[PDB]
mmCIF file of C-alpha atoms and ligand atoms in Angstrom:
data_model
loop_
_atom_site.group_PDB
_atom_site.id
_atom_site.type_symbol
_atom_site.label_atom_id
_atom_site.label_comp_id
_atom_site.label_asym_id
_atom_site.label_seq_id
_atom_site.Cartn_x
_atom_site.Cartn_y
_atom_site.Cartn_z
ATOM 1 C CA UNK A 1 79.564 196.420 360.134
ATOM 2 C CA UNK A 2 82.876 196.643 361.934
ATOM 3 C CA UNK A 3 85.302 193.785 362.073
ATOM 4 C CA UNK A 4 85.183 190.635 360.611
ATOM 5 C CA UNK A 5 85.128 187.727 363.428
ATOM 6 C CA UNK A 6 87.946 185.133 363.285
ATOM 7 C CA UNK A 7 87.966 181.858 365.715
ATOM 8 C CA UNK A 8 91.498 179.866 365.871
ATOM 9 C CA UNK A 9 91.669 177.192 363.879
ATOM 10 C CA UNK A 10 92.618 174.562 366.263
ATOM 11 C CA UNK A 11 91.950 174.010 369.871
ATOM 12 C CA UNK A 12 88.786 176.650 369.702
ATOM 13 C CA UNK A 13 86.194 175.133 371.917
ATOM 14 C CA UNK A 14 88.679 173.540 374.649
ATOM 15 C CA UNK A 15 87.764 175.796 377.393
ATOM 16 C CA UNK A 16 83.959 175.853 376.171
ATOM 17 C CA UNK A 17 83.958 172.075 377.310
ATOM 18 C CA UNK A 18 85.647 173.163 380.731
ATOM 19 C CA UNK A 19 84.041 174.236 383.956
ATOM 20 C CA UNK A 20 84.519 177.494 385.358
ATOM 21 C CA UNK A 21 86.977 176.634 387.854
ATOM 22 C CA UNK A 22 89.534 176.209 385.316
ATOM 23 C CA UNK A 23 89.700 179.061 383.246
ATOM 24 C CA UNK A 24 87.805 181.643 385.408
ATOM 25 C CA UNK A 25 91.042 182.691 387.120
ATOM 26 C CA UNK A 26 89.266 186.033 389.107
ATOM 27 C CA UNK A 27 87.518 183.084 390.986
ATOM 28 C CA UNK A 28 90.527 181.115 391.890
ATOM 29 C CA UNK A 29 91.775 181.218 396.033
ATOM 30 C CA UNK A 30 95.476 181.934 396.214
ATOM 31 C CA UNK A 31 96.963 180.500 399.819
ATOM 32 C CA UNK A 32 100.596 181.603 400.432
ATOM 33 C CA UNK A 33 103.181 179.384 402.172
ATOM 34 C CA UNK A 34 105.753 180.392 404.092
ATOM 35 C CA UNK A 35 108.869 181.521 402.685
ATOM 36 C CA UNK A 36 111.173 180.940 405.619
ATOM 37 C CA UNK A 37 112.293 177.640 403.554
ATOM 38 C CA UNK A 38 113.767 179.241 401.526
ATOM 39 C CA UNK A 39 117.308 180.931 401.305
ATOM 40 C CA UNK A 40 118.315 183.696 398.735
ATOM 41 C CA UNK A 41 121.562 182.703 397.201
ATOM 42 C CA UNK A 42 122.256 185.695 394.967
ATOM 43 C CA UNK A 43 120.121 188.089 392.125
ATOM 44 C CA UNK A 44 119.156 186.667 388.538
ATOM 45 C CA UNK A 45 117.352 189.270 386.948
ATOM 46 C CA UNK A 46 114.621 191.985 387.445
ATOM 47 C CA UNK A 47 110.889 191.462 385.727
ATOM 48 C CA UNK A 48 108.414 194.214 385.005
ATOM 49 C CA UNK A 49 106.846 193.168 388.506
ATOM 50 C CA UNK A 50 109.720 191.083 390.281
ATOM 51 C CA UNK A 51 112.730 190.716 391.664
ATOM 52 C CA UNK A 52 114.235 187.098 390.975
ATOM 53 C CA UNK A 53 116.951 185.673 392.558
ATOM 54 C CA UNK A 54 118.007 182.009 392.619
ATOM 55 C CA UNK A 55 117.569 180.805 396.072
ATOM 56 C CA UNK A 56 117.572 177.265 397.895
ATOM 57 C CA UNK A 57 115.394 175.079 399.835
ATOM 58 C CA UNK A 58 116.428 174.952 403.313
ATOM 59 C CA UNK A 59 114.723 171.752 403.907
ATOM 60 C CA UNK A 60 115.532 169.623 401.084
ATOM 61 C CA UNK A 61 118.637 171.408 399.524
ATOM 62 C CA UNK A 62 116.352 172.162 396.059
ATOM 63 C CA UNK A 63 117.868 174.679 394.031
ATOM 64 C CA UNK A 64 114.920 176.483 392.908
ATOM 65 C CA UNK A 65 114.443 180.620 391.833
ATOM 66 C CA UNK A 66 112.119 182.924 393.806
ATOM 67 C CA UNK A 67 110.074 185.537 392.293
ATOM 68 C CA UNK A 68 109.700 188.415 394.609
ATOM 69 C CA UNK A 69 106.493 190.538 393.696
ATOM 70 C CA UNK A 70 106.300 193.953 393.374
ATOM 71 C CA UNK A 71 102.791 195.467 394.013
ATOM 72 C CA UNK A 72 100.340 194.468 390.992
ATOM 73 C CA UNK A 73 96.414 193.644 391.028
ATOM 74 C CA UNK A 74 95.079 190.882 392.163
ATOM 75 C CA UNK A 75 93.402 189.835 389.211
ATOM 76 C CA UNK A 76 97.119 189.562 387.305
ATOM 77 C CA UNK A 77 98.509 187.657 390.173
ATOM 78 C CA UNK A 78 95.773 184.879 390.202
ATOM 79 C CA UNK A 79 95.649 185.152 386.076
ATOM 80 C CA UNK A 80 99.523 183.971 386.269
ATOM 81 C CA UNK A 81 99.400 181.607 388.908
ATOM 82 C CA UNK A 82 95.791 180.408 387.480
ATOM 83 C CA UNK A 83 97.757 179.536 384.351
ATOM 84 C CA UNK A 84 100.874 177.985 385.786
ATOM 85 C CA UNK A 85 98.872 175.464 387.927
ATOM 86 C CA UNK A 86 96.997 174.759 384.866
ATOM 87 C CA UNK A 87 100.120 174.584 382.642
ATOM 88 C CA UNK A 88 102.093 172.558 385.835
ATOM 89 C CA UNK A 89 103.897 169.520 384.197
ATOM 90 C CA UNK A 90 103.540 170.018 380.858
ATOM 91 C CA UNK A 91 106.281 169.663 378.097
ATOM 92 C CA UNK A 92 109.278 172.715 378.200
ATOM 93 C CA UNK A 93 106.818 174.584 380.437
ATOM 94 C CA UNK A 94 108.935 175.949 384.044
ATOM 95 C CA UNK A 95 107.591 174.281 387.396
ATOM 96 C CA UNK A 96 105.640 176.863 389.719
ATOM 97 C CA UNK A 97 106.684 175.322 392.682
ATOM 98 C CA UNK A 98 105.310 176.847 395.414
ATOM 99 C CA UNK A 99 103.352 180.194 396.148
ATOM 100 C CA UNK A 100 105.095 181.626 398.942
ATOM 101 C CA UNK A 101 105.535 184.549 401.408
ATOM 102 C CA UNK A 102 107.925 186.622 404.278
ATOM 103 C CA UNK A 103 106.536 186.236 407.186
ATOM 104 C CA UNK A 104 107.331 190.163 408.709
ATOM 105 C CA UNK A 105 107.164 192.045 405.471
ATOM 106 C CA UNK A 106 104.225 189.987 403.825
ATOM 107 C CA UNK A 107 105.792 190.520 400.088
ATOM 108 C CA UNK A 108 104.502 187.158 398.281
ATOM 109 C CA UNK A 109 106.232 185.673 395.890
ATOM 110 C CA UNK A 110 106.232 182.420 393.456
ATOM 111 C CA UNK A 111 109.099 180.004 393.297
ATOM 112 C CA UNK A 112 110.207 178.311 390.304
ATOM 113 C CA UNK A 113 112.194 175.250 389.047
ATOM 114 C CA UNK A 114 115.805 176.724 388.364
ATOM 115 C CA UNK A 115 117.128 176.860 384.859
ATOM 116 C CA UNK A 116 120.882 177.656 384.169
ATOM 117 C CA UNK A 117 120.067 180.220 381.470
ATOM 118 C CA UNK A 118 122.795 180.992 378.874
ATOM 119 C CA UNK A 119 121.329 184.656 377.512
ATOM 120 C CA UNK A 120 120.432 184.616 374.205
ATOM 121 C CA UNK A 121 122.951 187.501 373.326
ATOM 122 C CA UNK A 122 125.635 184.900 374.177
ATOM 123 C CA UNK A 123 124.378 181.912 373.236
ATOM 124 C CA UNK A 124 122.662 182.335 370.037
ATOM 125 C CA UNK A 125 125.655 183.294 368.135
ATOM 126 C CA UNK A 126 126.788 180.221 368.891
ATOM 127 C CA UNK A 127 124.180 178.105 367.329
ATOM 128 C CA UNK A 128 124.787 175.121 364.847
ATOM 129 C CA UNK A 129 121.595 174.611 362.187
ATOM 130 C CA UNK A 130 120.792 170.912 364.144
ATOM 131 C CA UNK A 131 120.808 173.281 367.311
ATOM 132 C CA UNK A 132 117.987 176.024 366.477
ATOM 133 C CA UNK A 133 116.117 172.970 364.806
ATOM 134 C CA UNK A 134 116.421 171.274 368.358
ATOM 135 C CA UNK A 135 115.563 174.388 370.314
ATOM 136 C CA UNK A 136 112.861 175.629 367.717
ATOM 137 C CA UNK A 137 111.460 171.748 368.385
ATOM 138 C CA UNK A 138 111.117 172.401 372.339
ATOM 139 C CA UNK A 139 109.419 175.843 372.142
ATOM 140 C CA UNK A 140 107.094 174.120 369.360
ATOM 141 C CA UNK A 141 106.337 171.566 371.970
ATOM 142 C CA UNK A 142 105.599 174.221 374.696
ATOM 143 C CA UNK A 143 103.458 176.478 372.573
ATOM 144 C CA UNK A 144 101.347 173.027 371.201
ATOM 145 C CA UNK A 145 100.954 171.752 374.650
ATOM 146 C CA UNK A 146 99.891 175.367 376.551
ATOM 147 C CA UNK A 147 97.807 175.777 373.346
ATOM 148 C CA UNK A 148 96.047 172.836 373.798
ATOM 149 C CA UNK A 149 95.366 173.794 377.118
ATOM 150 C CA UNK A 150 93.460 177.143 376.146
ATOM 151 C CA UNK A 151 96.240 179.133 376.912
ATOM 152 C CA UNK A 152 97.996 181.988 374.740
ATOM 153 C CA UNK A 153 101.147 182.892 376.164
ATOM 154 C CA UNK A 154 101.374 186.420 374.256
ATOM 155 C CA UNK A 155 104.871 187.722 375.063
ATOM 156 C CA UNK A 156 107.215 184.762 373.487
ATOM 157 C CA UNK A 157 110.613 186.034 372.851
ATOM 158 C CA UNK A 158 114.044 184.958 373.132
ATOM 159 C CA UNK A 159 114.115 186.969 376.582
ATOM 160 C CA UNK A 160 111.256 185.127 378.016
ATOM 161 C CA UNK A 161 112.717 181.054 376.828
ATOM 162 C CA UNK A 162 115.671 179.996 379.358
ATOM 163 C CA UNK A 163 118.138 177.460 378.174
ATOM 164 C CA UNK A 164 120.720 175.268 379.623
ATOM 165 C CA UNK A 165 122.761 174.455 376.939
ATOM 166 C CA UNK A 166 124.975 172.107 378.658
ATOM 167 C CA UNK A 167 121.498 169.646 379.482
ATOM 168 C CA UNK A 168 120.102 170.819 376.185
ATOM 169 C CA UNK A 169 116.731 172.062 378.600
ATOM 170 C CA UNK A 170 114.634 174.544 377.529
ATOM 171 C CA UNK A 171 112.034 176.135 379.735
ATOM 172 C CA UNK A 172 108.874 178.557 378.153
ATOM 173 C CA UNK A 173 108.830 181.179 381.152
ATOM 174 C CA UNK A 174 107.281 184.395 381.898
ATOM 175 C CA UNK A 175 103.175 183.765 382.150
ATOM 176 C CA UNK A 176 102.589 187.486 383.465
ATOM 177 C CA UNK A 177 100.735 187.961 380.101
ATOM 178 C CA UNK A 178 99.411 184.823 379.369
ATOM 179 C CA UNK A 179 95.338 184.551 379.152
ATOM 180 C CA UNK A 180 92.429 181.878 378.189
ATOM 181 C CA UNK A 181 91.106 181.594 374.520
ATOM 182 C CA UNK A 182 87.541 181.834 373.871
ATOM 183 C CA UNK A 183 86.588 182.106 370.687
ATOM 184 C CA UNK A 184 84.980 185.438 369.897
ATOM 185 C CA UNK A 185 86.558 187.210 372.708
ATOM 186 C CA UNK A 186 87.820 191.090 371.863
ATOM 187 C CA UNK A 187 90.732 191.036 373.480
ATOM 188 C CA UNK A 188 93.124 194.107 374.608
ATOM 189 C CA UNK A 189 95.814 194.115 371.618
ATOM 190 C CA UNK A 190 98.630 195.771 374.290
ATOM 191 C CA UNK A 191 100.269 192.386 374.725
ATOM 192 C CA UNK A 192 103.476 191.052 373.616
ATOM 193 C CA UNK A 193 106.907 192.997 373.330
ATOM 194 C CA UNK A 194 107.466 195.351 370.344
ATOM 195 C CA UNK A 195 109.890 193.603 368.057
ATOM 196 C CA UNK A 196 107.679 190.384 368.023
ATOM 197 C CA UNK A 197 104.021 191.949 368.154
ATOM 198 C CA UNK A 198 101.974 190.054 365.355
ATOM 199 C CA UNK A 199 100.393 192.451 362.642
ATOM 200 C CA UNK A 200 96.878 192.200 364.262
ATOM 201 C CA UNK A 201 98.300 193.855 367.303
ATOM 202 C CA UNK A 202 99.960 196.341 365.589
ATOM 203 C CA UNK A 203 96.724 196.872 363.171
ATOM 204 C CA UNK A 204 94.188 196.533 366.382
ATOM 205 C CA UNK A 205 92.882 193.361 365.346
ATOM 206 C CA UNK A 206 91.115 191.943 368.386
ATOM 207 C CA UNK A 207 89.787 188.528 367.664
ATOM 208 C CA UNK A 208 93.177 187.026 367.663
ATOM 209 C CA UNK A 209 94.298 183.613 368.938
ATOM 210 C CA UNK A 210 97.366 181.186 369.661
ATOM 211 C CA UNK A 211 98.351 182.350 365.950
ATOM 212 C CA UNK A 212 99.653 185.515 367.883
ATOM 213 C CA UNK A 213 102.778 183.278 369.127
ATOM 214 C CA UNK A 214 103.084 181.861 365.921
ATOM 215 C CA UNK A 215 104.279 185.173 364.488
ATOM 216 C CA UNK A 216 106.724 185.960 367.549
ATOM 217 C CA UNK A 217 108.173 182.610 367.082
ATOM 218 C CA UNK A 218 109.032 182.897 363.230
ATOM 219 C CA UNK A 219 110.520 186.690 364.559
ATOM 220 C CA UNK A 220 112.679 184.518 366.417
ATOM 221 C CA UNK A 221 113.491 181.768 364.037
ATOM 222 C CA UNK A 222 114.279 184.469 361.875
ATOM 223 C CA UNK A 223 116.707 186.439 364.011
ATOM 224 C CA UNK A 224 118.590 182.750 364.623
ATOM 225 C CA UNK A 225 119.025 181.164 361.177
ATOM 226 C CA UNK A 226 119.560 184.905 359.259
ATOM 227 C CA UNK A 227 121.783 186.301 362.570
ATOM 228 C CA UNK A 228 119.375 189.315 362.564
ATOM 229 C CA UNK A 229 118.681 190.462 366.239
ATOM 230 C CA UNK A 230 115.467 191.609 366.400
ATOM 231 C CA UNK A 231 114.436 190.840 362.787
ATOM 232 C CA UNK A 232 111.743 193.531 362.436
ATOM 233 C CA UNK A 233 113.380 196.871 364.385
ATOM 234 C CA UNK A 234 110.897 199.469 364.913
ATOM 235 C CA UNK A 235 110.982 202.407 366.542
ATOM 236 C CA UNK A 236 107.253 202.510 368.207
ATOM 237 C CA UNK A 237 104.342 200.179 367.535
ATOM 238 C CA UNK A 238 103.296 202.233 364.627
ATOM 239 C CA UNK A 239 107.079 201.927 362.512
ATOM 240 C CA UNK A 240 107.323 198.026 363.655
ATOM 241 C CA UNK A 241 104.159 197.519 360.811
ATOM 242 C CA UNK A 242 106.455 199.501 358.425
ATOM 243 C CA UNK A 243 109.378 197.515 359.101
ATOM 244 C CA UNK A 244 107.219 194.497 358.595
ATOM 245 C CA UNK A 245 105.575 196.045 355.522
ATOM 246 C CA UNK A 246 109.393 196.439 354.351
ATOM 247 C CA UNK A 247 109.572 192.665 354.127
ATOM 248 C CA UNK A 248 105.911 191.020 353.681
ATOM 249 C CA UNK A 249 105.208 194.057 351.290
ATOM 250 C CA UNK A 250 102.336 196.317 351.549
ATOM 251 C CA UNK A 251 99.959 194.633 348.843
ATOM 252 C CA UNK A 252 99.006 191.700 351.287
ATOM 253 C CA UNK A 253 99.174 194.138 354.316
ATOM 254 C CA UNK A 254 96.008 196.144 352.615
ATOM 255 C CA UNK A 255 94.309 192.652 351.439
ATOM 256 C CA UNK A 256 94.759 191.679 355.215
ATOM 257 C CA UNK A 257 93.337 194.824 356.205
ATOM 258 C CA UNK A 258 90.336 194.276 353.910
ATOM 259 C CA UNK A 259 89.804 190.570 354.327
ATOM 260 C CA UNK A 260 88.862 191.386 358.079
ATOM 261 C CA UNK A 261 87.383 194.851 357.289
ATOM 262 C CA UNK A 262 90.262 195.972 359.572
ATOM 263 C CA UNK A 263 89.503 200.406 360.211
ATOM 264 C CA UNK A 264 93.231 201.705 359.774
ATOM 265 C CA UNK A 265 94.704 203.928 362.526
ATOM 266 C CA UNK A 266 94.938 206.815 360.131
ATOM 267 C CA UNK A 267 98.485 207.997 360.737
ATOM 268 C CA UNK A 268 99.415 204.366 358.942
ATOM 269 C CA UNK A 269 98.887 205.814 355.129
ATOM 270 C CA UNK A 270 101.720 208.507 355.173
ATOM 271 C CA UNK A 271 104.158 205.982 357.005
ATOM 272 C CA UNK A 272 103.859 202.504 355.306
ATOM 273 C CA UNK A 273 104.216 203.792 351.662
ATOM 274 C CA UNK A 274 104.485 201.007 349.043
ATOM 275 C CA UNK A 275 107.067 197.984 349.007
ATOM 276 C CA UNK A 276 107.358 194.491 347.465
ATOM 277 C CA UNK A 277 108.207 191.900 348.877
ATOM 278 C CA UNK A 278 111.462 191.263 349.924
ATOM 279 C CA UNK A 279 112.375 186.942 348.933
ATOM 280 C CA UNK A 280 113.852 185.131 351.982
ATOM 281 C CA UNK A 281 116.702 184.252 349.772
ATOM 282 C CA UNK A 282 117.858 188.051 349.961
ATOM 283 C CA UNK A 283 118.336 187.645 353.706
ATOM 284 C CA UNK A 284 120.762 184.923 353.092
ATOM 285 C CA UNK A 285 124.816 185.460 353.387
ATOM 286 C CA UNK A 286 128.168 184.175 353.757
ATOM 287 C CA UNK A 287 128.056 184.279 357.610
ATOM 288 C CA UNK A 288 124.720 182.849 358.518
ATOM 289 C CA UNK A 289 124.400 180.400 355.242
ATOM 290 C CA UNK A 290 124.657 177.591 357.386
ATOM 291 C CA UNK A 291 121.754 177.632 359.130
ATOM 292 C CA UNK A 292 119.468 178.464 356.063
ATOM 293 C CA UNK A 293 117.608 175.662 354.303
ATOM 294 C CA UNK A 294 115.155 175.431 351.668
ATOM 295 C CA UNK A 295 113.506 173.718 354.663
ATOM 296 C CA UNK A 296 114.315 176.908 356.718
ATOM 297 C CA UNK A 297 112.823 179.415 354.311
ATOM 298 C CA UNK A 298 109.582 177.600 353.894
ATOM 299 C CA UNK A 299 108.901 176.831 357.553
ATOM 300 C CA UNK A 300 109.542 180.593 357.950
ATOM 301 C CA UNK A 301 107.586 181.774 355.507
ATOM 302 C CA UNK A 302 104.462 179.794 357.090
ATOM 303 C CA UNK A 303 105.105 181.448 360.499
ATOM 304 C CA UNK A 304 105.576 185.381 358.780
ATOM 305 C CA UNK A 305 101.933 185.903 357.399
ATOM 306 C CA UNK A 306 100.050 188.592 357.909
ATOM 307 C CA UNK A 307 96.517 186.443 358.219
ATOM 308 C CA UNK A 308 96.740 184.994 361.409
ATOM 309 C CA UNK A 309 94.592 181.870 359.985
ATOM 310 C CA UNK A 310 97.218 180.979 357.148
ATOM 311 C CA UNK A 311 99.467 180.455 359.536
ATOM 312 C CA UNK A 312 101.175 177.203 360.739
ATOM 313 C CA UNK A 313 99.655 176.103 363.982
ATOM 314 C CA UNK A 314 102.325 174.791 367.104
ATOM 315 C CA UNK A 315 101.372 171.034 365.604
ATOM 316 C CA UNK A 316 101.463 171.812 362.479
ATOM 317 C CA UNK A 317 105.029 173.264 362.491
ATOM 318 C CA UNK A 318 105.801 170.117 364.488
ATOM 319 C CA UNK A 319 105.341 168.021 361.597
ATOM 320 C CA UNK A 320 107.099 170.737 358.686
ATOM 321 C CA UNK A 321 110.827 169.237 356.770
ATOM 322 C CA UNK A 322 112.461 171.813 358.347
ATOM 323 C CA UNK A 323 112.308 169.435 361.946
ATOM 324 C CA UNK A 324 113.031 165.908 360.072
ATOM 325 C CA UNK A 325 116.315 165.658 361.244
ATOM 326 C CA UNK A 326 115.566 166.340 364.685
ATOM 327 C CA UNK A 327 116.283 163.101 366.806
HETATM 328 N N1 LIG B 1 113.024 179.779 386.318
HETATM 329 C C1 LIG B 1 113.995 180.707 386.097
HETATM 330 N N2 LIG B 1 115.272 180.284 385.974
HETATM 331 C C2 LIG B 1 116.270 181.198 385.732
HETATM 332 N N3 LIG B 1 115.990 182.501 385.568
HETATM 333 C C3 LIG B 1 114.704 182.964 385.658
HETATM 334 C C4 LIG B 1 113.668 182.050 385.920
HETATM 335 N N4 LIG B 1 112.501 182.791 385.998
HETATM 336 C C5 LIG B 1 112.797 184.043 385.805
HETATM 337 N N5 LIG B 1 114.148 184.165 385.590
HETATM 338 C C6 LIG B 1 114.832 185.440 385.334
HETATM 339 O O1 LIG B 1 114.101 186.544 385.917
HETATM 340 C C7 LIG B 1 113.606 187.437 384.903
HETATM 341 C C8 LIG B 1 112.201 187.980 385.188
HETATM 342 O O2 LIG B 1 111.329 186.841 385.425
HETATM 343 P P1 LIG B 1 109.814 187.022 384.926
HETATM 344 O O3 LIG B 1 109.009 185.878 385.545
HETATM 345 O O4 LIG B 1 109.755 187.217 383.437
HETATM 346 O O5 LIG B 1 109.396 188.400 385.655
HETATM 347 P P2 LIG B 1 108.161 189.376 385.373
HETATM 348 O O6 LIG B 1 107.975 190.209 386.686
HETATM 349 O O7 LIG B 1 106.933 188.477 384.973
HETATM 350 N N6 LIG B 1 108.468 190.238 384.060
HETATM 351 C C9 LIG B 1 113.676 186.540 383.658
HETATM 352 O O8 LIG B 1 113.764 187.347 382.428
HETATM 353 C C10 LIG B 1 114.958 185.711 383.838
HETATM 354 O O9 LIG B 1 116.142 186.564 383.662
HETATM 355 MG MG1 LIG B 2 107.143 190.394 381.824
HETATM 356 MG MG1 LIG B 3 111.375 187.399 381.457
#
């Protein structure tokens, strides 16, 4: 009979009740400005399809960032732009600012509200436990507002979340894989970055939902408050199940697997082998003590489920202990 279907459990039908112009992003007419207003300053970083450098507005002195584009398909330029005009405003979610190109060598590109980004491999060392509840907080309201919009952002990551510590602003970035939820859709499960792929990726599990980024966020929370960076390490797609299997165990891997009549790549049975669970508690130590909770370990281990439906949603998290002490 093949796969079990699965619908999210919250926000399912919100692009249902939407006309086409919003979420059919194929459709959508992209116009290009001119980017003469702007002046390149100096490089910021390199994307799988850019070139981003922080730049300035010539006519209004705006420091902004310009994403140069390398050549893509048209379909996954409108899909990103589609979904940053829709996402335009909301809560921790960057500014598209304008859609812009050079005149003489026609490359387009799309410029961004600037965010003085502290790189994770510097900054979240540095961390106090009121800090990654703070931070954890702002993602949580990204993912519940972009969420509530239809949208799954499907690559969150610590890469892909900029930060200015100073003006404790945090900015949900990165859209390039970012698509509309409709319940039922089969989508492609080649989304996300290895370390924080949820286990229906990994297992080909297609009927997923906004309970994908759930799972990448608790990979993060858990790298932060148990100074683990990435949590889960694999090698390929195939050992990051084993490294999860390592932790969740392997019994509720296999009831996962049956619960959605899941068919198991068969190069899985050799490699996963057989292993308890590993208690939170035994990921606690002297140096990172300080940031764990019972609070902590709960709120984690709602977020680090193998069912996608058990668990917490972006609201739901928003209301867990673990945030009561957040101003
Ligand atoms: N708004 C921004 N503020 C500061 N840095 C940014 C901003 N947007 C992008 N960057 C940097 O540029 C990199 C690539 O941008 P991104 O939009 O993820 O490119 P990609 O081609 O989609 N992959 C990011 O990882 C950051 O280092
Ligand atoms: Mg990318
Ligand atoms: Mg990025």
């Amino acid at each position: 009979s093949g796969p079990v279907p699965s619908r999210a459990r919250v926000y399912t039908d919100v692009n249902t009740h939407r006309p086409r112009e919003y979420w059919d992003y194929e459709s959508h007419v992209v116009e290009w400005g001119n980017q003469d207003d702007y002046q390149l300053v100096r490089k910021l970083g390199r994307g799988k399809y850019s070139e981003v450098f922080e730049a300035i507005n010539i006519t209004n002195n705006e420091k902004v960032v310009v994403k140069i584009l390398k050549p893509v398909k048209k379909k996954k330029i409108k899909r990103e732009i589609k979904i940053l005009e829709n996402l335009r405003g909301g809560p921790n979610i960057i500014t598209l600012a304008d859609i812009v190109k050079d005149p003489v060598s026609r490359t387009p590109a799309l410029v961004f509200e600037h965010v003085n980004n502290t790189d994770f491999k510097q900054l979240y060392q540095t961390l106090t436990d009121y800090d990654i509840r703070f931070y954890m907080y702002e993602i949580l309201k990204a993912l519940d507002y972009c969420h509530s919009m239809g949208i799954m952002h499907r690559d969150v990551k610590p890469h892909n979340v900029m930060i200015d510590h100073e003006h404790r602003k945090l900015r949900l970035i990165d859209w390039g894989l970012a698509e509309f939820y409709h319940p039922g859709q089969e989508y492609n499960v080649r989304v996300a970055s290895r370390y924080f792929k949820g286990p229906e990726l990994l297992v080909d599990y297609q009927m997923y939902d906004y309970s994908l980024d759930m799972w990448s966020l608790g990979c993060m929370l858990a790298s932060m408050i148990f100074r683990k960076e990435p949590f889960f390490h694999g090698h390929d797609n195939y050992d990051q199940l084993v490294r999860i299997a390592k932790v969740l165990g392997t019994e509720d891997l296999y009831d996962y697997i049956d619960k959605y009549n899941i068919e198991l790549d068969p190069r899985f049975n050799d490699i996963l082998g057989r292993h308890s669970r590993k208690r939170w508690e035994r990921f606690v130590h002297s140096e990172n003590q300080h940031l764990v909770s019972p609070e902590a370990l709960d709120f984690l281990d709602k977020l680090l489920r193998y069912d996608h439906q058990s668990r917490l949603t972006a609201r739901e998290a928003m209301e867990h202990p673990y945030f009561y002490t957040v101003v």
